[PDB]
Amino acid sequence: PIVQNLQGQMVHQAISPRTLNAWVKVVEEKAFSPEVIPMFSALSEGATPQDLNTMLNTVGGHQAAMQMLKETINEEAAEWDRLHPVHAGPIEPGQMREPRGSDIAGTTSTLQEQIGWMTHNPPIPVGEIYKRWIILGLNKIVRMY
Amino acid sequence: PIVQNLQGQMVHQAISPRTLNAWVKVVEEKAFSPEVIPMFSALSEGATPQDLNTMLNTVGGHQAAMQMLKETINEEAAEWDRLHPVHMREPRGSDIAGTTSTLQEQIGWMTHNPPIPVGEIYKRWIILGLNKIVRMY
Ligand SMILES: [Cl-]
Ligand SMILES: [Cl-]
């Protein structure tokens, strides 16, 4: 999700000023009416868990909603762990570990690990998965608005 | 936009359903108040000139604004040429606006070392036009 580095290579760049500016304008105008969801969805396209947490933490006010969001995420992270049984660790030493709920929510994973899952073949789309949990939470919250 | 395929090459990714759905919604609610501009800036993030043209051609109604936008783009393109004289090939104004350039040439400029950021350049002209149009609304 892309910027050119010094080596001439196209690599991931974190959620941009332009993207965040639009997100804050959407929050100011729409949080958390139903119209907020399509806008969140398009603005978070390509986002890592780290970018998603920036988005969640740039919401001013709405303390009740953001607390429901946090409850939703914690429950989905717990159910993800339950429904995706893993071995203790990778069988082959250097191989990429499978992400847990807390990796998807970005509390126990680094940006490099996130990008690693996202660009795996086949992808392990931890951004899309976290977004789904966030949209689950939004769909509960829109009832307040 | 542009994405890296399993071979490590940069290729086109079409504008996603979710992006194009949000841009339509922005147009329906905001075209062409000043509020449309930051939404356009974000939703066009990483757009090739081809994607930019897809976004512009999605705008239903506002045909007078779109005609003025077109005129602005044409003028910036002719100026670009004059300010960037030439003898892979460097883009001309019309290549930056997507009318004479292929999708592959656009990606090739955008990912060149250093980049010739034809998407960002075309966005700048579009925004110049949107800033004129805002005065009609
Ligand atoms: Cl993802
Ligand atoms: Cl560009």
Side-chain angles (χ1 to χ4, degrees):
Chain A
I2 68 164
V3 66
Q4 192 175 284
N5 66 16
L6 266 192
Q7 293 73 47
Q9 304 167 330
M10 302 317 294
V11 297
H12 174 75
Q13 70 171 340
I15 194 324
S16 76
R18 276 165 177 114
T19 290
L20 284 182
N21 185 56
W23 171 236
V24 300
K25 293 176 157 53
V26 165
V27 170
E28 296 263 333
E29 176 185 335
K30 303 174 158 53
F32 278 109
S33 69
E35 309 183 313
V36 79
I37 297 175
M39 291 300 126
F40 171 75
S41 166
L43 288 167
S44 61
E45 173 154 290
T48 63
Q50 213 150 264
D51 298 327
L52 291 168
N53 292 143
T54 294
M55 301 177 75
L56 298 173
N57 288 85
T58 41
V59 173
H62 304 288
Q63 268 92 2
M66 298 316 285
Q67 171 61 25
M68 296 174 59
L69 211 22
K70 176 165 209 301
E71 281 157 18
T72 291
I73 289 160
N74 286 336
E75 166 67 4
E76 293 304 312
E79 288 294 81
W80 181 269
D81 294 332
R82 185 179 72 87
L83 298 167
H84 299 77
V86 289
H87 295 309
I91 309 149
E92 313 274 355
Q95 79 169 133
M96 195 160 71
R97 71 222 186 59
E98 295 284 310
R100 312 189 62 251
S102 64
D103 298 309
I104 294 166
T107 62
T108 51
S109 59
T110 61
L111 185 52
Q112 279 331 111
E113 284 178 323
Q114 297 163 23
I115 296 304
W117 289 312
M118 288 167 67
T119 59
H120 200 248
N121 174 26
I124 296 136
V126 292
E128 299 292 342
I129 298 155
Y130 195 20
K131 280 173 60 160
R132 198 156 182 270
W133 310 347
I134 289 161
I135 287 173
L136 272 183
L138 294 177
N139 277 305
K140 290 159 54 94
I141 293 154
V142 295
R143 293 180 186 265
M144 304 180 93
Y145 293 93
Chain B
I2 305 178
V3 69
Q4 197 190 282
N5 66 11
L6 293 175
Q7 285 68 230
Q9 301 293 239
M10 308 305 162
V11 298
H12 181 77
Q13 185 184 51
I15 311 172
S16 71
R18 281 148 12 207
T19 295
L20 214 54
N21 297 356
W23 170 242
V24 169
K25 281 177 167 146
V26 169
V27 170
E28 304 265 329
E29 183 187 78
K30 295 168 180 19
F32 288 99
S33 67
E35 283 87 14
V36 72
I37 297 173
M39 302 296 131
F40 173 75
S41 277
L43 290 168
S44 71
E45 170 138 299
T48 51
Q50 183 182 288
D51 303 314
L52 292 170
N53 286 330
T54 292
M55 299 178 73
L56 295 174
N57 284 303
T58 286
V59 179
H62 314 282
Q63 97 207 0
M66 295 313 285
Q67 187 39 223
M68 188 170 322
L69 179 47
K70 191 147 93 71
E71 285 158 15
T72 297
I73 287 167
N74 289 354
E75 169 186 351
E76 288 302 309
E79 289 289 284
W80 179 268
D81 286 354
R82 195 180 61 84
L83 304 175
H84 301 83
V86 293
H87 283 136
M88 183 74 214
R89 74 184 184 81
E90 299 254 63
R92 308 279 66 215
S94 68
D95 294 311
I96 290 168
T99 64
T100 48
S101 65
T102 69
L103 193 50
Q104 180 152 308
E105 286 174 315
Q106 293 166 22
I107 292 171
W109 287 316
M110 286 166 76
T111 61
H112 183 261
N113 178 20
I116 307 154
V118 293
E120 290 293 338
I121 296 153
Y122 190 15
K123 288 171 51 163
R124 190 148 195 268
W125 307 342
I126 286 163
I127 290 163
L128 202 51
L130 292 176
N131 274 297
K132 280 166 168 143
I133 286 319
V134 168
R135 297 155 166 285
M136 299 185 92
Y137 287 85

